[PDB]
Amino acid sequence: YMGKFHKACFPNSTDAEPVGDFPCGKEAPARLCEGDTECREYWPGPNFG
Amino acid sequence: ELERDCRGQYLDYEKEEVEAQPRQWKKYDFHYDNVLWALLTLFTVSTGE
Amino acid sequence: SGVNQLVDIYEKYQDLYTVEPNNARQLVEIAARDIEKLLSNRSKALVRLALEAEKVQAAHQWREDFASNEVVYYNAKDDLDPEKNDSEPGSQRIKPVFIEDANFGRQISYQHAAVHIPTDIYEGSTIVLNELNWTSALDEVFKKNREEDPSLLWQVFGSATGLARYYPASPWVDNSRTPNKIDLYDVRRRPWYIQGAASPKDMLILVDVSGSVSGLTLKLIRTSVSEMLETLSDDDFVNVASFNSNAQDVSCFQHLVQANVRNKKVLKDAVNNITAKGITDYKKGFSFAFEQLLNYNVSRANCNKIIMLFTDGGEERAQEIFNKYNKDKKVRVFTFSVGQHNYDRGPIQWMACENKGYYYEIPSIGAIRINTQEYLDVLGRPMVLAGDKAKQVQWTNVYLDALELGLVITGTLPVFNITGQFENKTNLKNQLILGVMGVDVSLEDIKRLTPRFTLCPNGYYFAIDPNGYVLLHPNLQPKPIGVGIPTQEPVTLDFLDAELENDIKVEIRNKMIDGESGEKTFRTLVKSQDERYIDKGNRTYTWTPVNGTDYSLALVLPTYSFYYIKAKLEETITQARYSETLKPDNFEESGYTFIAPRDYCNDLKISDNNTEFLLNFNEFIDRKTPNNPSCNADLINRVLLDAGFTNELVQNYWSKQKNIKGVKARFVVTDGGITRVYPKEAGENWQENPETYEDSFYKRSLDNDNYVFTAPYFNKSGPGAYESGIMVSKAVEIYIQGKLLKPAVVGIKIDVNSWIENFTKTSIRMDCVILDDGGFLLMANHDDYTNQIGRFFGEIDPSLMRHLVNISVYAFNKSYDYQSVCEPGAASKQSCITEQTQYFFDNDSKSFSGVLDCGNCSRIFHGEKLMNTNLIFIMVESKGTCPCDTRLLIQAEQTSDGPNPCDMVKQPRYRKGPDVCFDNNVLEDYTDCG
Amino acid sequence: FNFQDETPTTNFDTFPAAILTVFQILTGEDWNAVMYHGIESQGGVSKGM
């Protein structure tokens, strides 16, 4: 589980705070998200990291 | 802080964008208003949750 | 161009018109009388409404049951759907029939008044229901007022319970029921309500930035101070101090400064940049407050001294500080216990009692909005007790209307609670106002009392506040005032910022503020309309005070504009043969015609699409005779006379020739409105405004009694410069009865190629450039500069630009535009202060020579100013030399911050405050510390 | 524990609040939320774990 809680899906390149306090994944079994969002790196994590 | 007052609408600043929400005179989930409700509330307290 | 042919045509028909004088004194007196009559009409309406409101609230019976007797009213934020289920228990809602009105531009119902209730206020409580019950007499008097004066705009009762009841029932603007369009409007924060609810303040916000206010408390304190500053007008003086064992100013201001947009922004930034640290000391802070309220060296409003204490709580009362500094109790103290905490709140509630103040609590954001309105509720006690000496009509700064109408000024009058009066009872809350009545006057309604079309396009009216702001000015646009760099305030534009500022204009401004009358003829730098040139004008300011108000009217008038041509068109057939020229089917013997969209007749609606307006103008001219009182005969007579003269020019001198190699377009523009451009081909490339009085070249060419060449715009997406040409113009200067009057301009749109060939033709008998006023490249020889034609020369080779300025052939003026749209940067488009500069001929000399001392090189130039035009020729011979292109001289509307406010408050502009104000009554009952 | 936007009720400001917080951690319920608050108070995860 190393570093898997850091991909949160962020708005469309707006560089704002991520939407949702849950990790995501761009792959199939992981939690996909919705609404013009991209699951990219550099989110501190849940519970303030 | 009264049922007379708690009517109409109000502005909620929780989302960081102003949104008008209804005013509801609600009761808490575990509420001691009876010896059967107090028994359940005290049971949930004793289980620690 | 044929200046002489148009001239001698004009003198050829002296029997067709009469020359009349513009007696500026009588014009100013007449317009001042008209404006005072308008404002007195609105004052009478306000007096009627306030009298009826007081009478009908005096005879109201309080109730707690409205189920048995419903209140019937129209709520502004009601959806148009016929929903029978949108009614409160105690209120039945009206569904109105909405017509479209020209005056308002919205759906308007004259059958009843509408009501606005803020979202944060429940619309069926007892207070609201009682107010909605007793405001029906207000509805009836609304009807009566509009019935005696059909020109009234919004007339409104701003209740102190939160309501607002304006007469022409119109749906609320965009915020009835719309996602992302939340309705934060509250009548008690509005500038007119803030103004009529009390007298000018002298605040001093003590913010308690100590250790114990870190976290949420400091957030709420800074938001609360921002929302407190947002309730201060331009008649109010405020500073913000902050204390933690040591009291200091939060900003660069050292004393009480005026609460205008710039100073309020500076204070808001300082409060937002504030941090919490250290131990509290309520004595060193109130000492600072009471010392700053004892400063009389600075400009102030000597009235309503206040201290706003933004703390949380503590065990310190500081009795001796108050007993030393506030012993006669001349200064109020409003204490705010901001935050969600459990500190002691006893001393906080006691400071308000012993200092005539009041105690407010702000536990969270959302409680911030209501408490500011509430200190202002407290401040109006001395005003109430002065029965009829406090009922005086006051007009607010120019602001943008909520129910969008453009720019308006509101006239306020407060309404007093008179339940127990001459039958004296306990009179518990008879010290508070019921509300404020306002009636709006459209700024475009004031503009119609100052007829502008009998003056030169350079002559105009302007009015002024006592603070120097302009009620009326050609440079006042319906946009909010910019306050800095982008990242419901009033439109407060000073007189010295609507024009160019000399010292003579400062003397004139000071004379107008004092309410005197006089005349002054002098020489002025008059900036051109396109904000790209400066001409050396010749003006004559005459001013009078408008009696009964605080406004002062003035009339700018050029020295040559003392006479105007009065059209003597009474033949009914001559005007017809003039009119026949205007249908857009004869645009091949006569030029492509555009008509100024003026108010010739009310049945004509002006159109941005000009040919549409031309079509309706021809249509109305076809059947004109029965419409005698429907509209003004003078405008149509003059425009038809000018059309006839223009036709006689375009046939008898332009149609006899048909073609010149050099020219690309021949045009004549006349003050009546005729701007016929000949070839009808360049008329598609024509991009000048149909109204001649807003044509930059026309206004420029009248002050300048010579040939003026307007360099086309660079890098502008459109017809461009090559296939349109470059503008050339000179103004006709006819003489009738030995009087100088200039009725029109003729011009040529010289083609760029036909000039470049002739310029390079003589080169056998490379760097040569032609510059006009403002240092713009009209045309050159290198053929790569001609690619960037019309572009500012400083952008081409800035080193020569700086040097040629250094000889002082080009002086420059840098000014500020506070009403300009602005691209937002990083730390759609917001509004900022843009800092526009314009160049012109500093000296009158004709020959200039020298050496350009480029870095480690040398360059030579010679400058010659072409006689009888605004051009200078520069013979500089140096290309691709060592790089002296360090920076650029970019003459462009550059985004900037305004003048440094920390330096402009130590020599503030002269300003006359309100005379009468009400504070410190002895009958006031202070035992309501809340 | 005077964070932005909030101040937790389970804080160690006074003695009653500290004693109640220690009692709540002893019973075991929601000790992790108090841990997160006490880590965020001593600087970020970066420097206060």
Ligand SMILES: *[C@@H]1O[C@H](CO)[C@@H](O[C@@H]2O[C@H](CO)[C@@H](O)[C@H](O[C@@H]3O[C@H](CO)[C@@H](O)[C@H](O)[C@@H]3O)[C@H]2NC(C)=O)[C@H](O)[C@H]1NC(C)=O
């Ligand atoms: C460059 O091209 C031609 C060069 O021939 C310029 O036109 C000529 O300008 C001179 C100026 O002094 C005139 O003499 C030429 O003839 C004049 O034509 C007018 C026509 O109305 C007569 O009234 C005069 O008496 C005189 O005979 C004139 N020739 C032509 C064919 O125009 C041209 O202006 C210049 N380009 C630009 C942009 O100015």
Ligand SMILES: *[C@@H]1O[C@H](CO)[C@@H](O[C@@H]2O[C@H](CO)[C@@H](O[C@@H]3O[C@H](CO)[C@@H](O)[C@H](O)[C@@H]3O)[C@H](O)[C@H]2NC(C)=O)[C@H](O)[C@H]1NC(C)=O
């Ligand atoms: C203008 O002032 C008058 C009096 O100065 C106000 O009328 C008074 O309002 C109070 C409410 O603040 C009334 O008291 C209430 O009476 C009802 C019924 O008796 C009771 O159920 C309430 O608990 C409360 O005690 C009072 O009767 C009423 N009239 C008088 C003569 O005092 C009036 O409200 C003021 N105007 C506005 C717009 O508030």
Ligand SMILES: *[C@@H]1O[C@H](CO)[C@@H](O[C@@H]2O[C@H](CO)[C@@H](O[C@@H]3O[C@H](CO)[C@@H](O)[C@H](O)[C@@H]3O)[C@H](O)[C@H]2NC(C)=O)[C@H](O)[C@H]1NC(C)=O
């Ligand atoms: C706007 O442009 C005008 C152009 O006239 C500028 O006014 C001119 O400014 C110069 C520079 O200060 C003045 O020269 C000074 O004259 C005094 C008095 O003789 C002399 O003692 C100084 O040493 C200096 O030479 C010049 O007189 C003045 N023109 C007039 C008609 O007064 C103006 O400065 C520009 N800027 C602004 C903000 O107006």
Ligand SMILES: CCCCCCCCCCCCCCCC
């Ligand atoms: C209107 C009364 C409804 C009461 C419903 C309460 C649900 C649970 C009843 C009591 C639960 C007992 C828990 C502890 C037993 C030792």
Ligand SMILES: CCCCCCCCCCCCCCCC
């Ligand atoms: C920002 C990420 C790296 C920061 C440096 C490491 C800090 C975490 C180590 C401390 C964990 C404390 C709990 C130890 C329990 C045995």
Ligand SMILES: *[C@@H]1O[C@H](CO)[C@@H](O)[C@H](O)[C@H]1NC(C)=O
């Ligand atoms: C204003 O009043 C003064 C004195 O009362 C008078 O001299 C002046 O003519 C008045 N102006 C107008 C426009 O009525």
Ligand SMILES: *[C@@H]1O[C@H](CO)[C@@H](O)[C@H](O)[C@H]1NC(C)=O
């Ligand atoms: C003021 O009202 C009167 C009648 O009420 C009207 O005749 C007059 O034209 C009004 N004045 C203006 C400036 O509209």
Ligand SMILES: *[C@@H]1O[C@H](CO)[C@@H](O)[C@H](O)[C@H]1NC(C)=O
């Ligand atoms: C107040 O309500 C009563 C009962 O509905 C009504 O008779 C009365 O006209 C109302 N007051 C006004 C000023 O309309």
Ligand SMILES: *[C@@H]1O[C@H](CO)[C@@H](O)[C@H](O)[C@H]1NC(C)=O
């Ligand atoms: C104002 O803000 C700047 C930048 O954040 C900061 O360095 C400065 O300390 C602030 N002013 C005060 C008085 O703290």
Ligand SMILES: *[C@@H]1O[C@H](CO)[C@@H](O)[C@H](O)[C@H]1NC(C)=O
């Ligand atoms: C005001 O001016 C006087 C004399 O010029 C000076 O003594 C005083 O310190 C100044 N400031 C205040 C606050 O009075």
Ligand SMILES: *[C@@H]1O[C@H](CO)[C@@H](O)[C@H](O)[C@H]1NC(C)=O
């Ligand atoms: C107006 O211009 C004339 C000449 O064009 C000049 O003599 C006069 O001084 C100017 N007016 C003023 C007030 O200087």
Ligand SMILES: *[C@@H]1O[C@H](CO)[C@@H](O)[C@H](O)[C@H]1NC(C)=O
């Ligand atoms: C202007 O109105 C005329 C007449 O109806 C029409 O032919 C033309 O297309 C209109 N142009 C624009 C830009 O609306």
Ligand SMILES: *[C@@H]1O[C@H](CO)[C@@H](O)[C@H](O)[C@H]1NC(C)=O
């Ligand atoms: C011109 O340039 C010199 C030095 O380059 C500078 O000292 C001077 O202020 C400039 N302006 C004038 C008007 O001489």
Ligand SMILES: [Ca+2]
């Ligand atoms: Ca403290």
